[PDB]
Amino acid sequence: RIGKQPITVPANVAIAMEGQDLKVKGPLGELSITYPREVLVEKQESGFLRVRKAVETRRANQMHGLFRTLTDNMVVGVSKGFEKKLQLVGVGYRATVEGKDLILSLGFSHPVRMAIPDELQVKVEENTKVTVSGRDKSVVGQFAATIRSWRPPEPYKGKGVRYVDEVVRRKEG
RNA sequence: CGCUGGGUAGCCAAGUGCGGAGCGGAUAACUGCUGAAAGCAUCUAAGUAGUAAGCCCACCCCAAGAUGAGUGCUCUCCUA
């Protein structure tokens, strides 16, 4: 299952294990997550962490696999980083950068002046598609959903803000 | 007011001014972000984001008999 899998820690990724807390030190940030009340972690003198249950119960079997893949997202998050590939479908849906902010002409009256945070490096390499880059997957997903929460792709319109190779329902009439 | 014609100050509107503000807080329905119990998944079981004329606060007034009777400033207790 999920919970029995060694944490693949790559090179130049320092593991810091503290009292009820994980402090990872990757080259692209230091993510910090408090341990659950029923999960105690063990290490075998290398780049392989193993979270372990502390009590025979159901909730430790919830946060065992949950906390397992969350620490996987910690180590892979601070080592390589996660990127989302949004795409503005259609004509006039242009997206560009204002230094600290990001502006989205989406067919409204005024283009949306949505502020990117400091932890995410976004890039517009072509005027439609926007690569939201970041360390942690949850912030990339929340801000990518926040940009997505203005114009979802309508089926008859066939034209909105969708991310790459995700199947979208379309209709003929 | 004998019946009429006008009218100051009052009162009144039909007249004249003003109000109904909030990237303030938490939510209901819903859309989600990572995401496990069934190595696939799923808005949730951990955490968390947008958001209702609805709830609360802010808004105007009364208001410590709020007996839980508040707080601050100031005055006065003399003669045998």
Side-chain angles (χ1 to χ4, degrees):
Chain A
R1 62 183 184 271
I2 295 295
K4 50 181 182 180
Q5 181 183 3
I7 299 298
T8 303
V9 177
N12 289 318
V13 178
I15 300 299
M17 181 180 72
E18 288 84 3
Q20 293 178 355
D21 188 76
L22 190 62
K23 296 284 184 68
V24 295
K25 291 183 183 293
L28 278 75
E30 293 179 353
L31 189 61
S32 306
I33 284 178
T34 303
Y35 293 168
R37 295 291 299 272
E38 290 85 3
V39 172
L40 183 62
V41 71
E42 294 293 328
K43 186 179 183 293
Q44 198 64 41
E45 296 292 327
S46 179
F48 292 100
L49 293 173
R50 289 182 185 272
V51 301
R52 293 183 185 274
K53 61 187 289 183
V55 64
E56 292 290 327
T57 187
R58 183 178 62 84
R59 189 169 181 265
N61 290 317
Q62 306 291 102
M63 296 184 288
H64 191 270
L66 171 66
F67 187 71
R68 171 71 69 189
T69 185
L70 281 175
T71 54
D72 194 3
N73 287 318
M74 293 181 73
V75 174
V76 178
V78 303
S79 67
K80 180 68 172 65
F82 295 106
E83 292 85 4
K84 187 74 175 177
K85 300 293 188 291
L86 283 82
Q87 183 177 1
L88 276 70
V89 179
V91 178
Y93 294 90
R94 64 181 291 274
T96 184
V97 183
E98 287 182 351
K100 187 67 181 294
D101 292 332
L102 190 147
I103 188 166
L104 293 166
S105 179
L106 293 171
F108 288 161
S109 67
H110 294 92
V112 178
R113 189 178 178 182
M114 185 63 73
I116 64 170
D118 54 354
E119 295 293 327
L120 302 182
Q121 51 180 355
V122 298
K123 64 180 178 66
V124 180
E125 60 184 0
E126 183 66 29
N127 293 319
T128 62
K129 63 184 177 70
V130 175
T131 300
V132 177
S133 299
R135 180 180 64 247
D136 186 73
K137 190 187 285 185
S138 178
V139 180
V140 177
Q142 284 177 353
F143 181 73
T146 303
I147 302 299
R148 187 178 173 88
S149 296
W150 292 100
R151 296 295 299 273
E154 291 183 353
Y156 291 103
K157 193 65 65 68
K159 177 171 67 66
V161 177
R162 66 177 178 87
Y163 60 95
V164 179
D165 69 8
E166 193 271 332
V167 55
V168 175
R169 178 67 67 193
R170 292 183 181 179
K171 291 181 181 179
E172 181 178 0

